Amino acid sequence: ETKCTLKSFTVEKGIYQTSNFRVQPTESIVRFPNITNLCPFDEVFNATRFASVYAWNRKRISNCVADYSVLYNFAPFFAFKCYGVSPTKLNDLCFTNVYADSFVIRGNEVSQIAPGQTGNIADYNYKLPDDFTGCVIAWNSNKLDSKVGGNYNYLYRLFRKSNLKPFERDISTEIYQAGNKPCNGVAGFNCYFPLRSYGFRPTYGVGHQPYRVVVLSFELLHAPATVCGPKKSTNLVKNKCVNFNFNGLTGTGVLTESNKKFLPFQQFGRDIADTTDAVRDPQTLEILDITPCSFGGVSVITPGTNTSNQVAVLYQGVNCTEVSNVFQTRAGCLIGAEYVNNSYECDIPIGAGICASYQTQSIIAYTMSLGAENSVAYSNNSIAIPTNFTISVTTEILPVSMTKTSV
Amino acid sequence: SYTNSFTRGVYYPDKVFRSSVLHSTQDLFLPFFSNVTWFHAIHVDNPVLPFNDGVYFASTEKSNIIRGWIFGTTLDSKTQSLLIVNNATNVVIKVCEFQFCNDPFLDFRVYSSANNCTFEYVSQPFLKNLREFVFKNIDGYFKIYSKHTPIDLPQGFSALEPLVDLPIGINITRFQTLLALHRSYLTPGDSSSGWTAGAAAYYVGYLQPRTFLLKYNENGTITDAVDCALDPLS
Amino acid sequence: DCTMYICGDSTECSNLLLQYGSFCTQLKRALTGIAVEQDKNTQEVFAQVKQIYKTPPIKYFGGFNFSQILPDPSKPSKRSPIEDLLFNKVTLKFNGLTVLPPLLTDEMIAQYTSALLAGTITSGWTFGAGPALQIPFPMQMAYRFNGIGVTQNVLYENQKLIANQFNSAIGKIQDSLSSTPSALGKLQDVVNHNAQALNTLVKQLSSKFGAISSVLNDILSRLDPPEAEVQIDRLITGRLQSLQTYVTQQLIRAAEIRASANLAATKMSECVLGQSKRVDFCGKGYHLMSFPQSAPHGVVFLHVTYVPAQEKNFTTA
Amino acid sequence: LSRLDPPEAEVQIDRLITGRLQSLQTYVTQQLIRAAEIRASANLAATKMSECVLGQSKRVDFCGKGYHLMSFPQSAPHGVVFLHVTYVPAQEKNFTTAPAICHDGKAHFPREGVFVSNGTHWFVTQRNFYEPQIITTDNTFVSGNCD
Amino acid sequence: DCTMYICGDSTECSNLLLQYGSFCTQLKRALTGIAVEQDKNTQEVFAQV
Ligand SMILES: *[C@@H]1O[C@H](CO)[C@@H](O)[C@H](O)[C@H]1NC(C)=O
Ligand SMILES: *[C@@H]1O[C@H](CO)[C@@H](O)[C@H](O)[C@H]1NC(C)=O
Ligand SMILES: *[C@@H]1O[C@H](CO)[C@@H](O)[C@H](O)[C@H]1NC(C)=O
Ligand SMILES: *[C@@H]1O[C@H](CO)[C@@H](O)[C@H](O)[C@H]1NC(C)=O
Ligand SMILES: *[C@@H]1O[C@H](CO)[C@@H](O)[C@H](O)[C@H]1NC(C)=O
Ligand SMILES: *[C@@H]1O[C@H](CO)[C@@H](O)[C@H](O)[C@H]1NC(C)=O
Ligand SMILES: *[C@@H]1O[C@H](CO)[C@@H](O)[C@H](O)[C@H]1NC(C)=O
Ligand SMILES: *[C@@H]1O[C@H](CO)[C@@H](O)[C@H](O)[C@H]1NC(C)=O
Ligand SMILES: *[C@@H]1O[C@H](CO)[C@@H](O)[C@H](O)[C@H]1NC(C)=O
Ligand SMILES: *[C@@H]1O[C@H](CO)[C@@H](O)[C@H](O)[C@H]1NC(C)=O
Ligand SMILES: *[C@@H]1O[C@H](CO)[C@@H](O)[C@H](O)[C@H]1NC(C)=O
């Protein structure tokens, strides 16, 4: 690695920085807030009495967590056709409003509840938009909406001047002016009642029995979304740096408890450097400080391929209690060298007064010596007078000019 | 009347925590040492109070003489007007499409004739008795700050804690106070119902976009704030 | 860290960073050269002596008092009261920014300072030009007085007065240093500049630099692979332009520190290790001697100056 | 300029020019810093040449460690090597020293050197070479009594 | 002046410059330090007496 960093083959004697030691996270948490306003889906699907096809009952679903996975308590659906969306991706996309339109219809008329299709129901009673992005569910309701004599309470419109528009309702009961003869509120020739009734009976087959059909249409106006589906996992891992996603604050670090008492309205904390330092647990009220785990730099203290190949590693600025003689210094900690207790001349500097060299054998680590020891006898009646001279030569090399270059 | 709000009108700018540091933010704050309107002698006219940048509602009401507030567009027919009515143990926050009178009083339950409300938002009941409130509208969120501190406005320092947020976007340009007393006057037109009660004063002070430098202590409570376009030292 | 400062825990950002060029191996090559240079400036002034000298046990140099400059054996850290006062006045791994500790700690610099003090007190100036020669301190003071032109008789006769004046000056220098809190301004300015440049880099990371957000985990989760790239490219450009100027300012400050350290080493060699004939190079006035004192990021020279006073009018020919 | 068409190659050419200019600006800045360093080093070298080769200096470690005598310059492809001749004392010896000498009621101080003693004897010598000489009037001067 | 030199008269342009952060502060902090240093060099040579 030192040769790769230096881009050479014969590295000299010294300490060289090659890479950085990074602890990878093991697991990953996603602590988003506890679940609440399950939208009123059960009261629309498990209602007590459904409305007519022309008077299709509408509820607006807004400001509520939409668990679309409580659909699968109601039995095999003759149709769960989700148009424009997938039956699996619906519990993910947030939406502004979810309009639920329920109505009872025959078994042969359940197919008419879809975009584009025409017939006798979705022309004058309940027409769906062409570009309708939602989900139509339909299931039989014979056991509940069938009377022996006949349940003539469910009505449906058969005649109308012109077809309806997307999501339009008509509750008028005026006689159908079929011919030119202007009707006078009486029924008869060319003047028929528009609303007829269903003869729901238990003896009917499977195509004419009562079928309850609901339609959930999702709206995504520019308005902010208020109905968002559910989300959660559960680990408050400590003493280990993991990936946290606490109510949108995402990061990597050790989540350990603390005594940083926050105010009630606020969710996360920040130091001076604008970096995050603590965060609320969206479930139990307790403040945990975010602190990075072991992180620093590796340095190879190599004596050079000229002498040998035994090298030593130095992790700088990090305690190596976490991830070959281990010894902790004040500038880091070095593995591969032994701490010798005789101070010699510094050869390869490390930091905080520790140096390495080759004893000859293995890399050593010793406190650098500032020099020898000599204490002169200071006396008020003693002096040291020289006798001999020495003519020595001292070399002092100094650069003068540089390489004149142009671009 | 006209008085000065020396060192009041500060709140928490964002839901972030700090520990003994300084944070400078360009927000919509009340300018220090401004000229606010002390409406203490107006015992039910002039309800024309704008809502351009918000309102700083300060009061020293004795006990439950206020009944709530109303924030609307123009107080006309089919106009979104939010009414926050504070009862003894619950508050009601509904927006109505109704034409409100000059001074809708509460002692009554139905304010106008043709009321038509459409929202549903219930929360914890809100109502030396200083009750500081700061109202604003940004990002489609009708945002309020409330504080209950013992005392006019003193020279102390007290931040305004964000309590309740509610999503709505409208052209809020209305503001009026709803009082409470003994003599029942069902007449909406007659704006004269003065009763012998405690001292009533609804402070009105408009906010301004300014840069504020707040000091967060070790516990995360704003104890000092400086403005940056008044005094040269600031 | 060129990889972690620009690209936070993102492998695609790391793959995109290698296409910019060899800036990652040059910005870290210049900063380590700065560090190795800083590891040398602290050896040309304090490590001028070869053998460490010590103070004799008898604390009688002839009448003078050096208790405030000699190390105190009571305090576990072997330093002088002046060094202890100077150390208590200098007020001193975030996103890939580490602070490397110096080689010579505050204990080895103190030992070098004590050795230099012992050499300049007991031996005089011979400890910096060859073998150390013992000599009484009054005779060394007579030497230094004769070196500037003043005869040795004024010192050999009025020795008690000179000793009392030196003791009073040594005692008053502590109050003088404690009076003005901005006396150690040159040592605090460099520390403040360093902590400000180290803190201004984290403050600029929150800037979007043109992108929609500032964190990589948001751009790599809202936007799709090939429309996040021009954003990642702009973010890398902005984070590299903020680091290039930082490295340039660090190089300029390192050159300034190197020039200051060369000047300090020259002053230590020409004022502490001997007497100089320069006017205001070893103090304002007539220089006699100089005592060094260590400090967390510098050196304080105490220059002893002989100043004439109480002049009188006379006739000359 | 051969794969892409004129106006979609421009933002690419613009980005390439920006990248190649940002890599040259920092190079020029580093060159200026290194040139300032070289200029300071050359000024120091010229000062040393003028104060050590072209004469003798009284500075301690400006013309070599010790007592400077002379300096010889030598050229080098990108610098100058100064060979400083240093006189270093050695083979020192212990002796007895005294400030002055009281004789005839007068305190006499040495002119140059110090009063050395080696046992029941006193001589005068310089402070750099042991040369015992008898205490005479030529190398001594009276400056009062020995009180 | 970063605000007049880069963004002249243009409030919209200044609001983009603020998103670059502390660059403008570290520029004027150094340029005024240069002036303070130049106001000191004229006092170490001429103001010795
Ligand atoms: C979340 O639900 C768990 C289980 O009921 C409960 O113990 C915890 O207190 C809840 N947290 C909140 C937000 O109250
Ligand atoms: C390797 O050792 C040889 C022989 O002692 C010496 O000539 C040479 O300079 C050394 N090279 C390195 C890179 O240390
Ligand atoms: C490393 O951790 C151990 C155990 O907490 C501690 O005793 C030691 O002082 C630490 N070393 C340093 C200086 O980081
Ligand atoms: C070196 O000294 C340390 C600290 O006193 C001691 O713990 C250790 O045993 C010594 N090792 C050797 C090899 O003497
Ligand atoms: C040296 O000093 C000591 C302590 O004052 C004294 O007793 C001794 O006589 C002195 N010797 C001389 C005169 O050199
Ligand atoms: C407030 O403004 C009124 C006019 O609007 C003025 O008369 C009054 O003096 C001002 N009060 C202060 C001191 O701000
Ligand atoms: C309103 O206040 C009255 C009087 O205290 C109380 O009886 C009633 O229950 C309250 N209603 C609400 C909405 O809390
Ligand atoms: C030397 O200074 C110390 C500390 O101020 C003082 O305690 C002591 O009396 C002084 N001694 C002499 C001889 O002046
Ligand atoms: C010397 O005489 C001059 C002229 O009378 C006078 O100004 C000056 O102060 C005197 N100085 C001294 C030292 O007496
Ligand atoms: C002088 O005497 C002292 C004390 O015995 C001794 O330590 C020193 O080495 C001697 N020096 C010489 C030059 O003989
Ligand atoms: C000291 O040296 C001198 C000169 O050689 C000599 O005359 C004297 O006798 C010596 N003293 C002793 C006692 O050796």
Numbering used by the authors:
A (entry chain A): 298 to 620, 640 to 676, 690 to 736
B (entry chain C): 27 to 70, 80 to 142, 157 to 176, 187 to 210, 215 to 297
C (entry chain C): 737 to 828, 854 to 1078
D (entry chain A): 981 to 1127
E (entry chain B): 737 to 785
Wording from the paper:
The matured spike protein contains two subunits: an ACE2-binding S1 subunit and a membrane-fusion S2 subunit. Extensive structures of the spike trimer reveal the open and closed conformations for the three RBDs within the spike trimer, where the open “up” RBD conformation is prerequisite for ACE2 binding.
To our surprise, we found that mouse ACE2 bound to both Omicron BA.1 and BA.2 spike trimer with high affinity, but no binding to WT spike trimer. Two major states were observed for both BA.2-mACE2 and BA.1-mACE2 complexes, in which the spike trimer binds to one or two mACE2. The second state is with two RBDs in the open up position with mACE2 binding, and the third RBD is in the close down position without mACE2 binding. We observed similar RBD-RBD interactions in all mACE2 complexes with the spike trimer of BA.1 and BA.2, which is consistent with the similar interaction in Omicron spike trimer-hACE2 complexes.
